Each structure stands twice: as C-alpha cells, then as structure tokens.
From a paper:
Like all kinesins, kinesin-13s posses a highly conserved ATPase motor domain that is essential for their function. To address these questions here we use cryo-electron microscopy (cryo-EM) to solve the structures of Drosophila melanogaster kinesin-13 KLP10A protein constructs in complex with curved tubulin protofilaments or bound to the microtubule lattice. We solved the structures of three complexes covering distinct nucleotide states and tubulin conformations: a complex formed by the NM construct bound to the microtubule lattice (straight tubulin) in the absence of nucleotides (NMMTapo); a complex formed by the NM construct, bound to the microtubule lattice in the presence of the non-hydrolysable ATP analog AMP-PNP (NMMTAMP-PNP); and a complex formed by the M construct, bound to curved tubulin (CT) protofilaments wrapped around microtubules in the presence of AMP-PNP (CTMMTAMP-PNP).
In contrast, in the CTMMTAMP-PNP complex the KLP10A nucleotide binding pocket adopts the “closed” configuration. The switch loops move closer to the nucleotide γ-phosphate and α-helix 4 (H4) which is part of SW2 adopts a different orientation relative to the rest of the motor domain. The closed configuration of the nucleotide binding pocket found in the CTMMTAMP-PNP complex is similar to the one found in the crystal structures of motile kinesins thought to represent the hydrolysis competent ATP bound form. The central eight stranded β-sheet, which contains the P-loop and spans several regions within the motor domain, becomes less twisted in the CTMMTAMP-PNP complex relative to the NMMTapo and NMMTAMP-PNP complexes. The differences between the curved tubulin protofilament (CTMMTAMP-PNP complex) and the microtubule lattice straight tubulin can be described to a first approximation as rigid body rotation of 12° between tubulin subunits (24° per tubulin heterodimer) and a small displacement between subunits perpendicular to the rotation plane. The higher curvature suggests that KLP10A can bend tubulin protofilaments beyond the typical tubulin curvature observed outside the microtubule lattice. A conformational change to highlight is the disruption of the binding site of the anti-cancer drug paclitaxel (Taxol®) on the β-subunit of the KLP10A bound curved tubulin. Despite all complexes being made in the presence of paclitaxel its corresponding density is absent in the curved tubulin and the binding site is partially blocked by β-tubulin residues. The KLP10A neck-linker is in a down orientation (pointing toward the microtubule minus end) in the structures where the nucleotide binding pocket is open and docks in an up orientation when the nucleotide binding pocket is closed.
Author numbering:
A (entry chain C), D (entry chain C): 1 to 441
B (entry chain D), C (entry chain D): 1 to 429
C-alpha cells in the first residue's frame, strides 16, 4: 500500500497543509468529519484513499499527517475551524513560544523540547504503514520553525529511516518582496540539511505565484489562501499516480531515477500549466500541445527565474485526464525542435512522461477552472543558481557588518557556523557551473 | 501561554494604563465590573494574555499599579474602571516623589520596591509560560523615571530572558512643565540602555500635533493623548491574541527590529487617523494606510525621519486584507524612498497581518520604526543637561538624597555615546 | 488612467472652478453630496479622470484649492457644492495677497507652497497613470498670478513630462478694476512662457461681449462669465472621458497645435451660443456650428483674428454627427479664408469628434485657436507696463517684498520677445 | 488549413476590424457570442470558418485576431458593445496613453513597453495554426499608433517569421481633407517599413471613399461606419478563395506571383465595382461586362488618383457569385480593346482572373445592396506615385521650417531620420518613373 506521511512545519507549513488536506478530502470524497458518505459500496482502495488516509474501523478516515508548530496560534485555527474532527488530536503538536524568526531558537533552544514528541508520533504512523513511500515535509525557508526545527527533524529522520525518500516543499525567499528583515540569515543556515538530508527539494516563492494569479488568472489582489491552493495542485498531481489508475504511472522513486543526475543536483523547479480563470477557460484550446508549451514558458515559473539563462538537465511531465500518449510525443518533438530550450549535451533522452486518468478537482470557492487536462512539469535546470546568487548577496551585505548575529549567538550557536554555511552554499553554486558545461578533450 | 505583566508607574503611566485597560477591555468585551459580554468567540481564546480568570467568570487584569503618592490611585479606583483591578495590586506610599529622580530611585523608592517585586512575582509565578513585561511610565517625573528604572533593573536580575519593553514619555523643549526634567530624563535613559529589549519613545508635542493637524481636535485633553498611546499599545501585541496570516510576537519583532544591541529605541505610529466628518472622503485601502504610517506628521515621537535613515521598520496590519498589497506597498516605499533607508540591510520592513480589526473600523495599521533620526531627541536633552550641570543648578536636591556627581557624568556620557551609535549607522556606507 | 489634477488658485480661479465642478458633476450625474444618480453607463466608465472614489460609492473631485485669504474658501464651502470637495484640500493662509505679485510669489506664497505641494503629491501618487494638471487662475491678482506661477514652477521640477495647461484670465484696457494689474500680469506671462505646455488665454471684455451680443443677456454677472469658461474647460478633455470617432487627448492637441515651442497661448471658443427664444430659429447642423467657431465675436479672448493668421486650430465636436461634414466644413473654411491661415502648414485644422453631447443639447463644438493675432494682447499690457515702470510708479510695494528691478526688466523683455515670435511666423512667406 | 492572422493597430485599425469581424460572423453564420446555431450538422470547415475562427471545443468560435491600441478608450467599446464574448480577453491589448499623433512615441517611448506582450500573443496564435498563410495588419498612415507602433511590430515580425506574407491595409492621407496637422510627418516615417517589411501594401484614403458613398451610393452624409464596411468588402473578397469553393481559386501567394513585378513595386490600389444602393440596384444590368468596366473607371477608385495618367502593370480580377468564366474573357477582351487603358510594354499577358462561388453578404443596417456578382480589382499602376508627390509637398513645406520637429526629437529619435525617410520615399518615386517606360536600344 502506497502510503505517504505528510509533515507540516511552521506557520507556512501548516497553512499549506490546510490547502492540501482540503483537496484530498474532495478528491476521495471524504466529508470534513472524516466520513465517506453512504453511497459508496465500491473499492475505496480502488479509489485509493489509502495513501493519505488510514481507515479507522466503523467508517472513519484519519489522515497520515502531523502538523507541528512552535506557536500555539496557527494550529488552534484547526481546533475548531471546520476540520476539528478530521485530524487525530495527538498529531497536532504545538509549542508555547515560536522560534520567532531565529534559526538558533528553532534548532537548539526551543526545538529540542518537542523533538522527541514529534519523532515518537511519526513512528506511530510509520508502524501503521505497510508499504511506506516517503515523507512529505512542508516548511518555509525564512522562518524560525520552518528552518530551525526542520533542520533538527531532518537530521533525526535520516538516522531512524535513512533509506526512505524525503521530499521537501519549501518556500524560498523572494528577491524584492520580503516579510522578514532577518530572512537571509535563516536561509543560509537551512542549506545544510536541504542538500544533505532531503533527497529531492522543491522551491517556490511568493512573487512568482503572485504574478501567476495576476496574469494567468486575473486575480487583482491575492491572499495566501489563493496561493496555497496552487501549491496543492502541484502536490496533488505529483503524488497522483500512487493512488489512481493510468497508463504510464510514476512512483515517487521513478522521479529520482529520472530527475536527479548526481546526488547534489536535486533542486528542481515545478510549474503547472493550465492556471486559467473560469471565464478565460472558455475561448480555450487547452489541448496537450498548448499545455506542454506553457510549462516551458519563463513567465509561468513558480520560482522567480528564467530558464533561458541556463540549460535544462531533465524534465518530468505528469499529465492528468483526457490525455492520449501519441499527443504527448507530438508535443515533445516540438519542444525539442525549439532553440530557446537548451538541454545539456549529456542528456540526450530528454525527459519522462507520466500520464494519469483522474482529472483535477475544482475546489469550491476556488480560483481555478474545470479543465479536462493538466500538467505539472518537474525539471532540473542550471538556472536555479541565479535565485541563489540573489540571496547570497543579501546575506553578504548584512553579515559584512555582523548585524543580527548577537541574537543568534546568545541562543545556542556560534559565529563560526555562518562562515561554514556560506561556503556550503557557494559550493553548490560552483557545482551548477560545472554540471552545465559540456566536455571536450 | 505568552502572558504579559503590566507595570504602570507614576502619574503619567497610570493615566495611560487606565485608558489602556479601557481599550483592551473593549476588545475582549469585558464589562466594567469584570464580566464577559462579547459576541465573537475569538475574544476569549487568548484572553489570558492579559486577564487572569477569577471566581464566577470574572476577568481580572494582570496589572500592577505603582505610585509614591496616593492621589492618582484614588482617581483610578473612582474612575470608570476602578472595579476591574484587583485591590492587592494598588501599591503606593504616602510621601511624594518631588519630581525628583533620586528621591524615587534611592530614598523612598528603594523602601517600596521590596513591596512591589513581591507582588510582581505573584503574577509571574502563576502564569503557564510568561512571555514578558511592559512598563508605562514617564521620563521627566519622580516615580515614572526613578521608581520605574529601579523596578526594571531588579527584574532583569530575576527574569533575565523575558521581553521587557517600555512605553515611555520623553520630554520636548517646545512643551515644558517641569524645570528639572533634563536631570530626571538623562538619569533614566542611562538605565533604559542596559536593561530593556524595546523602548517605544513617545513625546507630548508629537501628540498634540497629531490632535491638531491630523485629528483636527479643537480642545485636546490628556484623555485624547493617552487615547492615541493606548491604540499603539494594543496594536503591537495583536498577533499574540488574535489569529493572523502572518504572526509577530514581542520577541519576533525584537529579533528583526534591533540590528545591534543597545539600539532599541522605537518610534511608534498609528493609522488610520482622520477627523470626524472627513472619514466619508477617505477610501480605506492598503495604499491609504501606508501613506499615513510613513508621513512624518503621524509619528508619536517629535522627530522628522528625513534627518536620518530607518534602520528597520515594522508594520502590523489588522483586517481582512490581501498579502500582495501588503508585500507590494511595503516594497514601493523602500524603493521610492531608498535614500531614507539603510542600504546594507535589504528589506528593512517587517509585515505582520492579523485578521481582527478594531471594533469600529476595518483595516487599521501600526507603524514601528527604528530610525537613526532619534538622535534629535537625545541631543535636545543632552544640551539642556549640560547647560544646567555646568553651573550645578538644582543639584543639592539630588546630592542631598544619597547621590553624587559621578552618577550624573556617567549618565550624561552614556546618553552622548549612543548618539554616536545612531550616527555611525546612519552614514558611512 | 489619464487622470487630471486641478489646482484652482486665488479668487477668480476658485470662482471658475466652483462653477467648473458643477458642470462636470452634471455630466457624470454626481449628486451635490457626492453620490451617483446618473442613467447612462458611460458616465462611470471614465469617471476616474476627475473623481477619486471614496467609501460607500461617493465620488470626491481631485481638486486642490489654494488661496491666501480665507474668505473665498468660506464661500465655496457654503455654496451649492461645498459638500463635494474634500476638506483636506482647502489650503489657505490668513494674511491676504494685496493684489501684489511679490507678496504672493516671494513673501507669503513661498511660506505656503510647502504646504500645497505636499497635498499635490497625495493626489498624484495615488493615480494609476497620471496625465497632467490644470491651473485656473487670474493674471492680475496676487494669488492667481504670483502664487499660481510659484506652484507651476515647482511642479515642472518634479513632474517634468506631464501636460500642464492653464485657463488664465488676462486683463484688458477696456475693463480695469485694478491699478497695478500690468505689473502683476507681465511678471507672470514671463513664468508661463518657460513652464507651460498650453495656455488658454481668456479675457473678461471678451466675455461680456459674448453675453451682450451673442447670448443677449441683460444683466450679466460673474456667474455668467464663469459659465462660459466652464463650458470650454469641459469641452477640451471630452475625448478623454467619452468614446468617440476621433479621439484627442491633452497631449494629442499639444502635438499639433504648437508648431514651435514657446508659442503656446491659445484662444478658446464655444458653439452653439444662442439667446433664449432665438433657438427655435436656428437649425443645428455642422455648417451652423462652424460659422460660430470662426466668427470673431465668439472668441473668449478680446482679439480679432483678422489682424493675423491662425498657425493651427482645433475643433472638438460632440454629438452623433457625420465625418464627411466635419472633414468638409473644416476644409471649406481654410480655403475660403486662406489669407487668414499660415500657408507653410497645410491643413491647419484638427478635428476631434466625440459621441456624447452635453445633457441638454445635441451637437456642441469647441474652437481652440493658435493665432498670431494674440500679440494684440501682449502689446496692450507691455505699453501700460512701460508707461508706469519708466516713472517707477507703485514700485516700492514690490521692491519692499524682496524683489528688485532686474526681475521686472527681464520679465518685460521676455514679454516683448514673444511678440516678435508671433510676428515672424505671421508674415515672411 | 488556410489560416490567417488579423492584426488591428490603432484607432482606425481597430475600428475597421469591428467592420471586418462583423462581416465574417455573418458569412459563416456565427452569432455574436461565438456560437454557430444548432441547425448546422454539416461541414463547418466545408463552409471553412477555419481561416478566421479557431474552433474552441464545446461549440465555440474565437477569432484569429489581435486588437492592439496604445489608448484604452477604443478597445473598451468592444468591452462591452455587442462582441463582448466573441473575442478572447487576452487578445485585446490596450496601453495607457496613446502615441498622440507622434511617431517617436509609438516607435520608441511608449511602443516598446507593450511590444513584448503583443508579440508573445501572436506566437500563441501562430502555434494554433496548421497551415498559416500570412498576416493581415490594419493601420492608418498618420496616427501615432498606426505608424509608430506598426513600424515597430513589422520589424519584429520580419525577424521571427520572415518567410510569411505580411499584407498591409493602410489608410493613406487624403490630399485636401486632413484631420491632423502633423499628418505628413507620420507618413514619411512609416515609409521605411511599408516598402521593406510588408510584402504587398494596400492604400486607401477617406476622400476617395466619401465620393463613392455620395455618387455611387447616394449617401448624403457618411460616417466612418459607412466607410469601413467598404474596406471590409475588399478584404472579404480578397481572402474569399481561401475559404469557399470555386473554379479558379486564388491563394494569398498567387497574388504576389501575379501582381508584384519587382520587390519594390508592391503598392497596388484596389477597387470594388458594384457599390450600388438598393434602390439603384433595380434598373440594373449588373452583369460581368458592366462590373468589369467599373473597376477601370477613374472615378470609382479607392485612392484619389487617376490611372489615365500612368500605365497599368498588372491587374487581378476576383469575382464572387453567379459568374461563368466565358463571360469574363469576353469582358477582358473589351478592356484590352480600349485605348484609355494603357498597359506597359513588358506585361503582355495582362492579368489574372479569380472566380468564387460564394456571393457577398448584405450586412443588416448596411448601405450596399443584394447583388448576384461582385468584383474586387487589385491592380498595379504607375499612377500611385502621384498620390505620393502630393504628400511629399506637404512634408517639404513644414520640414523646410522644421516646425513640429521638437516634439519628435524629445521623444526618442534624431533630426537626421527625416532626411533619410524623405530620400527613401523619393527613391520609390524614381522607381515608378523607371518601371513604366518601355525600353529601346
Ligand atoms: C463612525 C466611525 O467610524 O467613527 C470612527 C472615527 O470617526 C475615527 C475618526 C476614530 C475616532 O477616534 C478619535 O476621535 C480619537 C479620540 C481620542 C484618541 C484617539 C482617537 C473614534 O472616536 C474612535 C473609534 O475607534 C474604535 O472604535 C477603535 O476600536 C478604537 N477604540 C478606542 O480607541 C476606544 C474608544 C473609546 C472606548 C473604548 C475604546 C481602538 C483602536 C485601537 C485599539 C483598540 C481600540 C472609531 C473607529 C471612530 C470614532 C468612534 C469616532 C479615529 O481613532 C480611532 C482610534 O479609530 C481617529 O482617527 C481614527 C479614524 C476613525 O475613522
Ligand atoms: C431649451 C434648451 O435647449 O435650452 C438651452 C438653451 O436655450 C441655450 C441658449 C443654452 C443656455 O445657456 C445659457 O443661457 C448660458 C448661461 C450662462 C453661461 C453660459 C450659457 C442654457 O441655460 C444651458 C443649457 O446647457 C446645458 O444643458 C449644457 O449641458 C451645459 N450645461 C451647463 O452649462 C450647466 C448649467 C447649469 C447647471 C449645470 C450645467 C454644458 C455645456 C458644456 C459642458 C457641460 C455642460 C442649455 C442647452 C440650454 C439652457 C438651459 C437654456 C446656451 O448655453 C449652453 C452652455 O448650452 C447659451 O447658448 C447655448 C445654446 C442653448 O440652446
Ligand atoms: N505561500 C505561503 N507562504 C507563507 C505563508 N505563511 C507564511 N509564509 C511565508 O513564510 C515566511 C516566514 O515563515 P513563517 O511560516 O511565517 O514562520 P514559521 O515558519 O512558522 O516560524 P516562526 O517564525 O517561528 O513562526 C514568510 O516570509 C512568508 O513568505 C502562507 O500561508 N503561504
Ligand atoms: N477609414 C477610417 N479612417 C479612420 C478611422 N478612424 C481614424 N481614421 C483615420 O486615422 C487617422 C489618424 O489615425 P488614428 O487611428 O486616429 O490614430 P491612431 O492610429 O490610433 O494613433 P493615435 O494617434 O495614438 O490614436 C485619421 O486621419 C483618420 O483619417 C476610421 O474609423 N475609418
Ligand atoms: N501623555 C500624558 N502625559 C502626561 C499625563 N500626565 C502627566 N503627563 C506628563 O508627564 C510629565 C511628568 O510626569 P508625571 O506624570 O508628573 O510623573 P510622576 O510625577 O513621576 O508621577 C509632565 O510633563 C506631563 O506633561 C497624561 O495623562 N498623559
Ligand atoms: N471671469 C471672472 N473674473 C473674475 C471673477 N472674480 C474676479 N475676477 C477678475 O479677476 C481680476 C483680479 O483677480 P482676483 O480674483 O482678484 O485674484 P486674486 O486677488 O489673486 O485672488 C479682477 O479684474 C476681476 O475682474 C470671476 O468670478 N469671474
Ligand atoms: Mg509562527
Ligand atoms: Mg487613439
């Protein structure tokens, strides 16, 4: 059984999980009080709720998730809210003071006081699994709990489990827009666990999703509730072939065989192509051809980036719905025809097609439309180093004058760890300069 | 969780706090007797931030009231909300302070501080997990300056890791009603340096100017000045009590408002502030709130931020608003005004967005600024101090009460040193 | 998009603008309180050209009201439309201008212009994409001449690529009610040369003569003269607000009305203008409207265009009319009268045709002329100026306020120079 | 599939496109909300809507057009108006200030700010094509957007596409009637892209269509709504054989093989012969013979010109309706018989007959009649140089005193470009003096 554990850390990590666990309850037909309605005398595991919902006896579906925060406030929206008896009470873990935009508090001072309680709960979910696939850690680079605690947890999850995949769904700091002043110090320090302990780390940022809401979707003034529904469509498409029938299904390990070249080259950016408002979803030609081109567009990226400045290394096309595979090969061969899209010279078999039958679900109150087809494109490219050079420069400005360092040293870390994590991220950026360039003799 | 002990001291600090416990007690629906008469369920989920629950669903504030004179205590008991406080927290002597720092910090304040800290620890030891403190006091009196900084410097010896901030009133040369207020303010800025995590410096000249120019009040009283100050004090700890989209505690602000230690003197500010009548003419939107929070005439400290650079600022929004407009208007200010922000810190602004606006308006906001232009305050005091002390004027009222001159010249020099700490971090690349 | 800030200054400019905001507010169905009571859907699609929308579907004009005397401000508030404006845009001092240019441009106007430009930038920074400005003022007063040209010459330093035009009243020797008006008008024509993109020169002698001869009014008041001027001011920016068959913005006119720079002084004009009673006798057609726009007695500037040549003209038609008759009647004039048009420019006339006539008539029109005959205005002033200044009459009221004679003789000579700029482009092939 | 992209630039370019896209909706039976009615279970591509209308699934026909203007006002008549859900929302592109009769603003200052947005939309229509024929750019010489932006766009469309035909449908300035004072400066500057980048440029002017409405049609007082319906009948006949059956069909490339001698001799004037009011359409003999003679008449020209002052070089007769080809050859041989009509001495096979079956459509509220037959005559002649000499003389008057030059220099161009575009148009006028004259030894 193709089970997965979702881990939601910090305020952004919880609040995305409200948008994820809204969606799977609709994809599988589960009421907010955990009940499937009485008109289903069919195969539930044939609809395969059993990757996100362990079936309690006497008709009850409790999720395979743990919400962790160091702050009591965010998880108390889930108690009550509307999902007040969807979740088990012991898998909603709150602290008493948050890490308060401080990596040293989330990793050393405050984080060690609940880290035994979090890890002990994951084992009670790891023992209920038969065929555990891997972990789905959600957080944000640039919190205290999203960076300090998650760095503490991914160390401990690598020692206990190790061989499992551990996917991350991070929120990376945006170049112009920022909400925290100490936002660059908490992102250089989470670099060590992101490359070492995770096996495939994703990054998004809020500017690149603000522009998609404004341009592709005509929302004039988005909130975070609009954005996290777009993160959740990426996740719902990625983990889809675990739990629905289709030709060319893709497990979570068939990504990493086909998306990750070298063990430090595992930072792929995602897109999602039919982000179309419902009025613009008429006048449509939302075929396989048009939805394949939109993923390669540099304006529709989920990261503020431009893949025309670097070279792609792999892609991973995951389609949902009314999709016939001969339409996909006719759309790949147009993508390889274009000279704007540079692959590397050691790729030559470009990328991997996955297809699924289950079409996407329209959230009531949602912003999206009701489409027949949708594509997530996970794709390694060398252009994600440019997002890192725009954040090293902000770190190098503030740490040149050692500004906010006195908060971090007086909480459980040393001054010398800044000079190690700056070199550590500068070594990845040297790896992308050396993996993109073709070789001669 | 995350409780706040409130230590209002003196005449001015008690008058602000008496108006402060009438705004909070409206935000949570507390009756003047102490019962609950609210309608929203969010008014009780975090009511323990300020209020201990007592017998029979009465809610007693966690406030400790200090004075060296029984008169202001008699006013607060006989006011609208004398019923709300507990009578064991009205701590007061009989012999007044004299508008004298030495008399309230050494002679007649040290005699009382044993009987105040023993009450502070009754509040702090009953909390589940205390967060911090707040003083409301006045640099310029006997009890607000002297007794306030004796209370502060005896809590950091016992609670050395809790957020202690003050909402302190600083004098101005345009508005004087005390001859010896430079002596009384220099000797307490010296204590606020080494002992405080945040300091929200407020003037009175900056508060009439908001009432005159912005609010268009005709006859402002102290009840109008304290009404502005009490709207700031509620605005800072909003995300501590109500759920939000971004949260910001007292400690979360102090992490990214204070670059170096000892630079912890903030300029508060509130928005919207309209006159009556001219509120049907202003549309309430996020670009409207942002223009008030950065205009100089909406500062509660009598300074102009055009004479310096903001190190860091914070903006706490309260209402069902977006996050793009918050993240874009806070961006369109620090690029249009990039010569007024320090450029070795990218993105000087912190946004906090709650979900619950005040009970009569939608979409309020609160501006908190760490500007280098606050050296205009500390030099206007340190010019008056060094003009009196060089003739040793009014000095025997201080040396007669135990002090000596070595405490003065140290306190003068520590005031003049942090002027040269905002000066370095203003200029020079 | 394409917003217009309105800066009415002085007594005469405020009286015109108060009548101007009663014509626009009828074209868009704005209530005297500010609500909307229209019936056509085109009245709201471009209402943001003049009106900021406020809370509760109220529409506040984007107008800034300047005076150096509180009296005319009290009249506009207590008029029919005092409810419409925002009370934060009534900027006024207390000490009057004296009908003195120096007192309103140097002493008591420069003290106020900081408190006016700070309000101008609240309007301009809230717009989506601002187009330009408009002053309504009076060459001949203290505030309309002096304070108006200080406001102008401080906006071109900040908004140096926006269309700034003025609707300015120029004196005439037939109608004088001010002794020192040549001093006050010569010193502001000098400012209008280097700082303005279009200048719609209006007289009062030309406006009684329209009321006497054309309109057949018996007792004209200033409310009748400003009613004509306000019908011009709406007519120029019509295609900016309503859809048309040809469109013409403020910038589109200025491109092809102004051949060389510094030649930007226009003669306005309106059609139809009939008496009451004699409107059942005139058929309303395009050859009927064209005869009024080119007769000399329908000019709002006291000149005769038979003493010169039109460089360029413009005709803005409002109504469901054809395009052949517009393109043919504008052709049959500049061939019948080819000695009155400059012949090195073929097709001197620009046609603009909107679709929406005013709310009581079909097929209006607006004539705007760049004629060389406007040197008749600037020489009638520069003969009076040089007859007073050669005896230095009334001069100590100017040199006592900071000025000196070097500002006069420069301003006299720049007036006399552009007389020799229309003179060159009138004659000589 | 014989698809074509219509590009409508500026106020005149949009407002002609309201008259074109009114007409094709009637020729193909498409309601204003894009719907064909339910009584058509036939071949739609056999009626061939698929050159002007891409069929969105679930029964929806969205046009292959983009309306561009720098002014918001003109395209907001299309939102709403009546065609408020005919057009896709993203192919109606508005600026915020117009170029305001200024070539330097439309080409340098303002035009570059939306030129990436316009070109990116054309690629989304170029990718929906299977068999793209070419571009149909509509504008007006003598605007700012019609001249400045169109010169900017035709540069970029020549680099991206190149090999495609790019037809222009310009409105040229009239000799006596003009509406702009700076009308000659904006027409000399658009000369460079009209001869270099377009492949076949058409010209009309408003006087020569005013006279047709007054004389051939007895409209006493025309508006622009009357005129643009006459432009649209020329276009509807030219592109007709792409999308209807008939003997002797003519593609858009069979024009240029048969109409254009040399690569700079591509400026042909059009006519349209049965412009007859409905009361005058009785008492008629509207046969092939009478409708062929009317095209060669110098009063029925769409340009203020006289082809008895120059020599024809090719013609191109395109007939619609009840037309038998033996009637055409008997009407050609009368045209070659006349001595008023001078061909050149290197033509001798005079001109090309195209015939189509689909008769013209009467617009409700229209001015035209219901005829059985109609002829568009595209015809190169040396007499179109005389329209150019009447406009050089207006340019040479104003630029002799350098009148309106200060508006153009302070917006993004130099004074020297006037002296290059004046020489550039004087070289075409030297080409028509040297192409008309027969050769001896
Ligand atoms: C019809 C209407 O909307 O009236 C408004 C109003 O006109 C204005 C002018 C209010 C008014 O405030 C004042 O005039 C004022 C008086 C003394 C000190 C400070 C302000 C108002 O009195 C204040 C009142 O404020 C509240 O209700 C808030 O919840 C506020 N409450 C108190 O301060 C309070 C007052 C008395 C008793 C208990 C509480 C608050 C603000 C922050 C944190 C907690 C509470 C409001 C919106 C209004 C009136 C009633 C006219 C303004 O003030 C506030 C605090 O909102 C002044 O500028 C703002 C803009 C408002 O629109
Ligand atoms: C029965 C009838 O048709 O009456 C007409 C009328 O008799 C005449 C004489 C009107 C009349 O105008 C005047 O007598 C007048 C008075 C003071 C200043 C200027 C004019 C009229 O009052 C003026 C009025 O104008 C309008 O309604 C326009 O919309 C006009 N509105 C205003 O000026 C206005 C007046 C009061 C309150 C609000 C607006 C307008 C013009 C341009 C731009 C915007 C608005 C009209 C057509 C008439 C009357 C009513 C008699 C005329 O004026 C206008 C502006 O149309 C004067 O010559 C024209 C020709 C009209 O036929
Ligand atoms: N996309 C998205 N991003 C969010 C959301 N909430 C917060 N963020 C981002 O998260 C960053 C800060 O992390 P937080 O989640 O606020 O803080 P934390 O991870 O909970 O740790 P603490 O600071 O101790 O609360 C901000 O800069 C936001 O950009 C959200 O709901 N959606
Ligand atoms: N036939 C026809 N010609 C038009 C129409 N509208 C405008 N014109 C012509 O176009 C010329 C000016 O170009 P415009 O379209 O008005 O201006 P533009 O191209 O939109 O560029 P801008 O000046 O920036 O608005 C005028 O001289 C008219 O002759 C129309 O509807 N039909
Ligand atoms: N804002 C405000 N200031 C006050 C109030 N009461 C007194 N002050 C100011 O406080 C200063 C002196 O502080 P004081 O109240 O006398 O403190 P104390 O004598 O030590 O108790 C004076 O300059 C007053 O202007 C008040 O209610 N509000
Ligand atoms: N057309 C018109 N002219 C006016 C009006 N009021 C005053 N004037 C003229 O303006 C000239 C003086 O300008 P004034 O209004 O005194 O300007 P100020 O003193 O600077 O405010 C006088 O000659 C008046 O004739 C008015 O309402 N309409
Ligand atoms: Mg948090
Ligand atoms: Mg236009």
């Amino acid at each position: 059984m193709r089970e997965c554990i979702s881990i939601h850390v910090g305020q952004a990590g919880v609040q995305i999980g409200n948008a994820c666990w809204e969606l799977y309850c609709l994809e599988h037909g589960i009421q907010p009080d955990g009940q499937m309605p009485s008109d289903k005398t069919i195969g539930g595991g044939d609809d395969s709720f059993n990757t996100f919902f362990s079936e309690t006896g006497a008709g009850k579906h409790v999720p395979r998730a743990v919400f962790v925060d160091l702050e009591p406030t965010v998880i108390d929206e889930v108690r009550t809210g509307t999902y007040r008896q969807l979740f088990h009470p012991e898998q909603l873990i709150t602290g008493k003071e948050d890490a308060a935009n401080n990596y040293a508090r989330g990793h050393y001072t405050i984080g060690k006081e609940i880290i035994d309680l979090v890890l002990d709960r994951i084992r009670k979910l790891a023992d209920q699994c038969t065929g555990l696939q891997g972990f789905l850690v959600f957080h944000s680079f640039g919190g205290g709990t999203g960076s300090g605690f998650t760095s503490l947890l991914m160390e401990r999850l690598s020692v206990d489990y190790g061989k499992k995949s551990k996917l991350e769904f991070s929120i990376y700091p945006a170049p112009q827009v920022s909400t925290a002043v100490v936002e660059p110090y908490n992102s250089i320090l989470t670099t060590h666990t992101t490359l070492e302990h995770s096996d495939c780390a994703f990054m998004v940022d809020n500017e690149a999703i603000y522009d998609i809401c404004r341009r592709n979707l005509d929302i004039e003034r988005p909130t975070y509730t609009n954005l996290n529904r777009l993160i959740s469509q990426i996740v719902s498409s990625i983990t889809a072939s675990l739990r629905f029938d289709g030709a060319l299904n893709v497990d979570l390990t068939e990504f990493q065989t086909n998306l990750v070249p070298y063990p430090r080259i595992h930072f792929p950016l995602a897109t999602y192509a039919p982000v179309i408002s419902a009025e613009k979803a008429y006048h449509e030609q939302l075929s396989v051809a048009e939805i394949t081109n939109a993923c390669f567009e540099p304006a529709n990226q989920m990261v503020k980036c431009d893949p025309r400045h670097g070279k792609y290394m792999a892609c991973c096309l995951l389609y949902r719905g009314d999709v016939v595979p001969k339409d996909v090969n006719a759309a790949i061969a147009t993508i390889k025809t274009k000279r704007s899209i540079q692959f590397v010279d050691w790729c030559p078999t470009g990328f991997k097609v996955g297809i699924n039958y289950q079409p996407p679900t329209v959230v009531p109150g949602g912003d999206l439309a009701k489409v027949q087809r949708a594509v997530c494109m996970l794709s390694n490219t060398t252009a994600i180093a440019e997002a890192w050079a725009r954040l090293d420069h902000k770190f190098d400005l503030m740490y040149a004058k050692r500004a906010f360092v006195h908060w971090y040293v007086g909480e459980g870390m040393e001054e010398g760890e800044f000079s190690e994590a700056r070199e550590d991220m500068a070594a990845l950026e040297k790896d992308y300069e050396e993996v993109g360039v073709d070789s001669v003799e | 969780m995350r409780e706040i002990v409130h230590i209002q001291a003196g005449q001015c600090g008690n008058q602000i706090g008496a108006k402060f416990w009438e705004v909070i007690s409206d935000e949570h629906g507390i009756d003047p007797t102490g019962s609950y008469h609210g309608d929203s369920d969010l008014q009780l989920e975090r009511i323990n931030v300020y209020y201990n629950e007592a017998t029979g669903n009465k809610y007693v504030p966690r406030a400790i009231l200090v004075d060296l004179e029984p008169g202001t205590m008699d006013s607060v008991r006989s006011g609208p909300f004398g019923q709300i406080f507990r009578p064991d927290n009205f701590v007061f002597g009989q012999s007044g302070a004299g508008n004298n720092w030495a008399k309230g910090h050494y002679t007649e304040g040290a005699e009382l501080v044993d009987s105040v800290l023993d009450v502070v620890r009754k509040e702090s030891e009953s909390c589940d997990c205390l967060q911090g403190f707040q003083l409301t006091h006045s640099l310029g009196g006997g009890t607000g300056s002297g007794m306030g900084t004796l209370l502060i410097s005896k809590i950091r010896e016992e609670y050395p890791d809790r957020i202690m901030n003050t909402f302190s009133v600083m004098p101005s040369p345009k508005v004087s009603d005390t001859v010896v207020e430079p002596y009384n303010a220099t000797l307490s800025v010296h204590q606020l340096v080494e002992n405080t995590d945040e300091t929200y410096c407020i003037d009175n000249e900056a508060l009439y100017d908001i009432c005159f120019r912005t609010l268009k009040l005709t006859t402002p009283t102290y009840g109008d000045l304290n009404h502005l100050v009490s709207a700031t004090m509620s605005g800072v700890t909003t995300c501590l009590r109500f759920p939000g989209q971004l949260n910001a505690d007292l400690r979360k602000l102090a992490v990214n408002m204070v670059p170096f230690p000892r630079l912890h003197f903030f300029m508060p500010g509130f928005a919207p502030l309209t006159s009556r009548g001219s509120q049907q003419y202003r549309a309430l939107t996020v670009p409207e709130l942002t223009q008030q929070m950065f205009d100089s005439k909406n500062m509660m400290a009598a300074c102009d931020p055009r004479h310096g650079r903001y190190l860091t600022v914070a903006a706490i929004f309260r209402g069902r608003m977006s996050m793009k407009e918050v993240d874009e208007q806070m961006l369109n200010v620090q690029n249009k005004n990039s010569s007024y922000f320090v450029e070795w810190i990218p993105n000087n602004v912190k946004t906090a967005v709650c979900d619950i606006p005040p009970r009569g308006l939608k979409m309020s906001a609160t501006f908190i600024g760490n500007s280098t232009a606050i050296q205009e305050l500390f030099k206007r005091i340190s010019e008056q101090f060094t003009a009196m002390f060089r003739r040793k004027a009014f000095l025997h009222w201080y040396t007669g009460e135990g002090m000596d001159e070595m405490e003065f010249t140290e306190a003068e020099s520590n005031m003049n040193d942090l002027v040269s700490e905002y000066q370095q971090y203003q200029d020079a690349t």
